[PDB]
Amino acid sequence: HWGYGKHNGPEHWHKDFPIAKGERQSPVDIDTHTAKYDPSLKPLSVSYDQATSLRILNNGHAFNVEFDDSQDKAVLKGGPLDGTYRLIQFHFHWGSLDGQGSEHTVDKKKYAAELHLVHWNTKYGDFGKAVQQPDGLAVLGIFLKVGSAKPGLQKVVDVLDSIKTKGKSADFTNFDPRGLLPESLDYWTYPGSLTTPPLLECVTWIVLKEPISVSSEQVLKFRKLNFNGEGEPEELMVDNWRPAQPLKNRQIKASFK
Numbered sequence: 001h002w003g004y005g006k007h008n009g010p011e012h013w014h015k016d017f018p019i020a021k022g023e024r025q026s027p028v029d030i031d032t033h034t035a036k037y038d039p040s041l042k043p044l045s046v047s048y049d050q051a052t053s054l055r056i057l058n059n060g061h062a063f064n065v066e067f068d069d070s071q072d073k074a075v076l077k078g079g080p081l082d083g084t085y086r087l088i089q090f091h092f093h094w095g096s097l098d099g100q101g102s103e104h105t106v107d108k109k110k111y112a113a114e115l116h117l118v119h120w121n122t123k124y125g126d127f128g129k130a131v132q133q134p135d136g137l138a139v140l141g142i143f144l145k146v147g148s149a150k151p152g153l154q155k156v157v158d159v160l161d162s163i164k165t166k167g168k169s170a171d172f173t174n175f176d177p178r179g180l181l182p183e184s185l186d187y188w189t190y191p192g193s194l195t196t197p198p199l200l201e202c203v204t205w206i207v208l209k210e211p212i213s214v215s216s217e218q219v220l221k222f223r224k225l226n227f228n229g230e231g232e233p234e235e236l237m238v239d240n241w242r243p244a245q246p247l248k249n250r251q252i253k254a255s256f257k
């Protein structure tokens with residue numbers, strides 16, 4: 001099946017998922033001079049004080065931290081959104097070197113990694129229903145640059161040894177996702193898609209202007225993970241990012257001037 005290798009990577013995905021060539025695919029390059037300031041955009045409202053993380057999983061493409069979404073515990077609202085979206089998981093995309101790794105780019109600049117906080121629209125009742133709707137998901141995207149260590153990330157870094165290979169999971173309770181946010185919540189927004197198969201075009205993307213810093217050692221630990229399962233030949237989990245797609249008939253809006 002699909003992956004990020006030479007014979008199954010993003011240039012091949014359209015054969016099994018023809019929407020790979022659709023009208024609102026992600027990620028995109030954010031051209032900061034042609035993005036449009038929109039004064040009618042509201043501030044983001046991030047309410048993560050009651051978040052309940054459950055576990056961390058190596059799913060063979062990235063690693064996911066999953067949360068309890070049976071109730072409105074950790075929600076996102078405001079910004080360009082109408083309604084309440086519940087946090088279900090977060091994951092990252094990263095590179096084999098510091099110069100690449102993010103999925104979105106800013107004026108063609110790539111960052112070392114990108115954090116994706118996935119939320120789904122509660123009016124649709126469950127995540128499976130929400131992904132079938134043009135306004136079903138809202139994903140908060142955060143860039144990582146290499147520099148100073150990010151203290152709030154270290155707990156994630158320390159458990160990666162226990163989920164080295166595909167299909168492994170570990171108990172991961174009491175993790176506070178507020179530790180991953182930058183200082184400012186200024187953002188760009190556009191309508192887009194999932195960036196992995198099935199590539200459904202169900203996402204309101206909210207991409208924060210301000211990156212967070214992580215240390216060289218922290219991102220090094222990311223690139224020790226394994227695409228393969230235990231007992232298979234080792235393939236390091238690196239460069240699990242999809243390249244920028246054509247913007248086509250879309251406009252990037254900015255919350256800031």
Ligand SMILES: NS(=O)(=O)c1cc(NC(=O)Nc2ccc(C(F)(F)F)cc2)c(O)c([N+](=O)[O-])c1
Nearest residue numbers: 061062063064091116128131139194195196198
């Ligand atoms: N980069 S991203 O788009 O934000 C992104 C999304 C997911 N998760 C899913 O896509 N789940 C899912 C989607 C549809 C169905 C359905 F509807 F088919 F059942 C079932 C499950 C993910 O695991 C990663 N990742 O890399 O770990 C990245």
Ligand SMILES: [Zn+2]
Nearest residue numbers: 091093116195
């Ligand atoms: Zn993602």
